Amino acid sequence: KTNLANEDEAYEAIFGGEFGSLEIGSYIGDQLEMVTELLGGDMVMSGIVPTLQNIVATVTLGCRLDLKTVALHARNAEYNPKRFAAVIMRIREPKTTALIFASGKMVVTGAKSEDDSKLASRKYARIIQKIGFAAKFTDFKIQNIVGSCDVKFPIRLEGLAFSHGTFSSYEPELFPGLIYRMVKPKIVLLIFVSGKIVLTGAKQREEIYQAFEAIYPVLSEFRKM
Numbered sequence: 001k002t003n004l005a006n007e008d009e010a011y012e013a014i015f016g017g018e019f020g021s022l023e024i025g026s027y028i029g030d031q032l033e034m035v036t037e038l039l040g041g042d043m044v045m046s047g048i049v050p051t052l053q054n055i056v057a058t059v060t061l062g063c064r065l066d067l068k069t070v071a072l073h074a075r076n077a078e079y080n081p082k083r084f085a086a087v088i089m090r091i092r093e094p095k096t097t098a099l100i101f102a103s104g105k106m107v108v109t110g111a112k113s114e115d116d117s118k119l120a121s122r123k124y125a126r127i128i129q130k131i132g133f134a135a136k137f138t139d140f141k142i143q144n145i146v147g148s149c150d151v152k153f154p155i156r157l158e159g160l161a162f163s164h165g166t167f168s169s170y171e172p173e174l175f176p177g178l179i180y181r182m183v184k185p186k187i188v189l190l191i192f193v194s195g196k197i198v199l200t201g202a203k204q205r206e207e208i209y210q211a212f213e214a215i216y217p218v219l220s221e222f223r224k225m
Contacts, residue, residue, distance in 0.1 A: 010085040044150040056144040061104035061135040096120040147199040147208035154224040187211035
């Protein structure tokens with residue numbers, strides 16, 4: 001019943017996964033590799049500070065788009081309408097990917113700052129104007145921010161899963177480590193046994209830091225020694 005050649009289904013899928021738009025790489029190309037790629041930028045409260053690994057933004061271009069025309073005249077662009085009802089377009093700087101729907105909605109991913117996200121988004125809109133559409137850059141919203149961290153010590157995940165069972169789950173079909181669902185701020189932390197962490201669900205980078213600040217004393221209690 002899930003048919004991604006329908007635009008409403010294709011758009012809803014980017015955001016409808018278990019971890020939301022953290023999984024966007026599945027539509028621009030596995031469960032485990034999608035998370036572990038976020039641990040490999042150039043880097044990843046004792047000198048430890050998170051870093052931004054991905055930002056997902058949405059933009060309304062404001063006109064209906066003919067996707068075959070967009071794909072034809074854009075350089076690095078793929079349009080397989082049977083596989084997925086959107087054009088996949090990439091630019092080199094800021095290195096990003098955009099998904100462009102017939103309704104003029106655009107999803108932009110791959111930037112590591114909020115300013116890079118907005119500039120790349122403006123570039124994709126300009127590319128579509130230059131092909132010959134009444135696109136306008138409107139309604140820029142950052143939808144998700146993914147951060148990563150490394151506390152540089154091993155974690156006794158098995159004690160933490162029990163002690164914080166109310167906020168935690170071990171779901172190996174989804175993730176080999178621990179899925180920590182923080183209440184305030186509302187952030188999902190994917191905790192590996194080695195001490196690396198992926199944080200997701202933020203709308204502002206402050207929430208990434210607040211989630212890390214809250215979880216660091218907890219993980220110290222569970223340092224494997």
